[PDB]
Amino acid sequence: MLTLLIVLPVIGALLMPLLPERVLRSVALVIAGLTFALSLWMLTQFDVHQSALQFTEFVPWLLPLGLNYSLGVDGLSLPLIVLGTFLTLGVVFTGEKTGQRLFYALVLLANAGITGALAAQNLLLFFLFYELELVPFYLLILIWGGQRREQAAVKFLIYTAVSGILVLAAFLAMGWLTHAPSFDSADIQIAGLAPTTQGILLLLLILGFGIKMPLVPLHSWLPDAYVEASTPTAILLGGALAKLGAYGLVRFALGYFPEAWAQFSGLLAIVAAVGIAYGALAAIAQKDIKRMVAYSSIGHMSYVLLAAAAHTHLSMVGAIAQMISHGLILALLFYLVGVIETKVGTRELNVLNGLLNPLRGLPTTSALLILGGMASAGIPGLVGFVAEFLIFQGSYGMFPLPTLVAVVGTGLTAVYFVIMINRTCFGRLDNRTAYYPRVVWSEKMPALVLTLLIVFLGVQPTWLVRWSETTSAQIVAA
Amino acid sequence: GTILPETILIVTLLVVLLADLIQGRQADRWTPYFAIVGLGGAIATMIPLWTQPATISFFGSFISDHLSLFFRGLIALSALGTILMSIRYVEQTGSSLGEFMTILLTATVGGMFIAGAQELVFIFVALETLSIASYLLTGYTKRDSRSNEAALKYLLIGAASSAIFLYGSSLLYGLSGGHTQLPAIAQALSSESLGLVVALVFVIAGISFKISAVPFHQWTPDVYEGAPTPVVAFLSVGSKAAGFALAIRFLTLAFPSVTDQWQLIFTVLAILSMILGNVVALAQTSMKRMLAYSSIGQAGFVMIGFVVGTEAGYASMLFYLLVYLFMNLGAFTCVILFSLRTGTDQISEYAGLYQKDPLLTLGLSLCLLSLGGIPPLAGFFGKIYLFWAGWQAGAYGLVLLGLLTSVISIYYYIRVVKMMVVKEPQEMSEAVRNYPELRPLQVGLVMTVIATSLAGILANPLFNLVNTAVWDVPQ
Amino acid sequence: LVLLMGVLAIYPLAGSWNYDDLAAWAATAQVNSTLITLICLALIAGPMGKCAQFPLHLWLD
Amino acid sequence: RITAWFDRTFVDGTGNAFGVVTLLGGDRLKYSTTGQSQAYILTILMGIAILVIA
Amino acid sequence: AVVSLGVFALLTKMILQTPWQLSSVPPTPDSITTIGQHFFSDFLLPFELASVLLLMALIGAVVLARRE
């Protein structure tokens, strides 16, 4: 079943060459929608209270390398896969109107890599799909994008390449220090060894996944690669890769070193608090919108680290919910900011003004922008509040000061999103620079669907949590 | 005595004569075929004696085990891939093609003989057979001054390297009484002395010249710019194949593995190769020079296979040496195909090729990414096996340097794909703005590109081959 | 938002938030003096800003 | 205004310096290939008599 | 100059230090018949490949030193 999720985008990518244009777009839509629908069906048949792997597949592939093709989906992994497939469908729907044959190919390859990396119970296979994700996003940042594509793209590449290194350096090592064959996880890979080495391996995994998540000082590719990327590229990159990094960190660094994590929790909580405060205070100063939203992404990913620093059964349901919430909210905000930049032709915070009045000035993307910005900050009725409050309630029994600092970070998030909404939606229109083009009906459909899903999951939040309740128990209570 | 192991070489040898006499009579000939057919027959002659008989020796002067067959087939396949590229290339130049294929096939014969040779005299004769033909091929296009200076430089370096290797061989013959044989020397001298260390270093000095280990590297950047590009394609695949084959057959079997100071020497050379050949390659403007320094770096990668020799490092080395064929033949076929059409130039002129010629771009980017080690592709699994065979032994530092250099290499390998794809109609180079719009070149390009993209995931059939080959290395 | 800090530190102390479990809890409570001082100061500062009180009063003007 | 500036100067720069250094280390080490074959033979001869010492 | 003097000193130390096996038996006077026996019994591969070596050297040298 998972093999379909991995192969269908690969088939579409290999089929984008040697295909006529009209068929090029229609078939890309078809493949993306099929993968998405299959993901939903899998999610329905995901019958819960299992506490074990589901939809498993095992084939021996490369015996002299471990590298068995061993898939399998859990409660931590499946919501992320459904999220990736939804974002892929959206990104394909609002694809680029230029060089649109190497786009659907690369987007489908990227989705294949993400879905594979999530549903892979083999370490070296996970790394295969990780470094597979490495390059097509470089190509997406590079072809489509802004003035400073090249530099930006290069940055991303290297900070991801280095990432791979660390992860690989910490797999091979922890694949040999236990004299185990068959790198596949949930298996003979059993740490059970002396300290002072578990520390080094855990730090390697932290620095290899915290650089993609991204964490506090390892983030310096995110502002450059989100801002110089077209809106579909930004959506896909943010959601897909950020969740890949966070999933990697949680799964591996918590299922393999539970003795070293309990000792590094005290430092990781403070690092996460510093990260939230840092993202907020750095977003407050930015005078370009996409930069504010990128620092929003940093701040919202630091919540996952604060949640994982506490081993609470609640603080992990909260972590998965925060991953899903940040995916949806970042998708919405990047889509809205892309629409604004297209229609208005500028992205600064001192020439944008008055985008909320009915006739002459873009008012349903501004209303959605105010609804996404308040969802990003902690405002009940939307998904961000549910996720953040689960994290807070789970992380207060443990260290209480980093939780308070996280609350202050949420306040500062509200601060800079209000700054952006005031200097973007409120105010008056400049009456020489107006005459924005109209927004066509099937161009604000993705934002209007993301908004409906966000407002739904915030008032009926059970459908955000009922998937990763037993899996989080299996994660932390072990 | 047991001349059966030679029915692989003599076949090619016959072609050398037949693709020569026909050039004496005709002078406008179709020798490109019945030369591809000659190499095909030479390779098909290995199936009868790959598994059917055991390991055999000619007179002690030659051995035909599975490792020998592996390296012989490797060099023959490199020559087969080079013959395809060099048809419309040296024909477009005002030169002959039979007098070039005879030299190429003689270099192939030398490389195939040096693989299974296990005697001092015959080793020297095969190495010099390779080197002379390499000089002649480097200086073939005698109209260009760069080709002549490159041939002179390569000859002056290679002849000195051969003189040093010969001094080492004479010392090795004198230390162990007589015994020009390789295995009869290990039995004679079995203790580290000053003479043995000097012979070892003097042999290494002539090995590293072939496999391009720094500081014995400084000729490839000046030879790859000078030589005809198909000669460079044969020189980066076949010459390294012969050098690594001779290194395995020499160091392991002749220099008594009790004197494993060569593992230290090759650790030094591999560290230095990885560091240099990838850092300096990062600042280059021509594709051939970039590929030269890349080739130095890849030799540095391979040299962590037999520096930790554990029956898995040897297999990792052989697998990467097999995949390197598909990567570099395909990376040089696209370079030739581009420099043929209009360009005849460097990296900066690649800008905007996605619009005019998409097949060349899809073929060159695949091979450059394979060289960089990108997932599913022939290079990713080669490098992963090289790095795990290095951890599984204990060489943390070597592998942790190989990974960082792999990132450094991803940078300048993707910098070319940058030019090939990014550009809009206003940023095409002056060589693409007027890009025009030879069947063997395409049928070799397609084959190497589909091999470098499928020999990664369909790697299990050619892991048993590598393992049965590695079973022959002593330890 | 400081009301959130307050409601967040009243759960480990009272096990609930129902204005009735809190009443029963406050009836029979012997926990630290400064701890409840801080949490009730937060519970104050919430409505203090919501009701336009010093110093959070400029918003009403 | 401090933090952003910090991010724009100290963090970002610290991540770029490495790259820049690796560029310089390649731009001023290509000169090791001097273009003189006698220099190449000197480096080959410096390879020996040093590995012989080590 | 310095690398030459150093390599010569190193080689001289190696030559004066190692205990060669002198094997005090008078050599053979008929040293050409033995070389004739070794061309076709032991060193048959090199004797046969030297012909192709000479042929390829002739071909390549005529090609390089040709006039056109």
Ligand SMILES: CCCCCCCCCCCCCCCC(=O)OC[C@H](CO[C@@H]1O[C@H](CS(=O)(=O)O)[C@@H](O)[C@H](O)[C@H]1O)OC(=O)CCCCCCCCCCCCCCC
């Ligand atoms: C903060 C709460 C957020 C909830 C609001 C929900 C979003 C609005 C739902 C829209 C339903 C889908 C149809 C919309 C498109 C359409 O019909 O015509 C588009 C035109 C807009 O002008 C048109 O604007 C178009 C540009 S654009 O669409 O506005 O982007 C263009 O067609 C042309 O300019 C112009 O006529 O009509 C509108 O959509 C504007 C009305 C809809 C927006 C209402 C926002 C005003 C309330 C904001 C705050 C709500 C407070 C109450 C409690 C929350």
Ligand SMILES: CCCCCCCCCCCCCCCC(=O)OC[C@H](CO[C@@H]1O[C@H](CS(=O)(=O)O)[C@@H](O)[C@H](O)[C@H]1O)OC(=O)CCCCCCCCCCCCCCC
């Ligand atoms: C403890 C953790 C939980 C607590 C919550 C976290 C603390 C939040 C405190 C709020 C701090 C204010 C944010 C800084 C705003 C800024 O950057 O520039 C200053 C902005 C202008 O920014 C400008 O805004 C402009 C847009 S706009 O037109 O102004 O809207 C824009 O163009 C310009 O670039 C931008 O600089 O102007 C303001 O100062 C408006 C802020 C008014 C906030 C009221 C105070 C709220 C707290 C109560 C204080 C009680 C105690 C007082 C002393 C007794």
Ligand SMILES: CCCCCCCCCCCCCCCCCC(=O)O[C@@H](COC(=O)CCCCCCCCCCCCCCC)COP(=O)(O)OC[C@H](O)CO
């Ligand atoms: C300890 C301090 C912490 C503070 C935060 C720092 C943490 C950073 C983590 C480092 C990640 C590596 C970042 C590499 C920077 C690449 C960015 C870059 O710019 O690439 C340059 C070049 O990139 C490279 O050269 C590749 C080589 C980079 C290799 C870096 C590896 C660093 C890893 C450090 C590990 C050290 C080993 C320690 C082990 C004990 C190009 O610069 P440019 O201005 O020209 O860009 C435009 C472009 O050139 C136009 O096309």
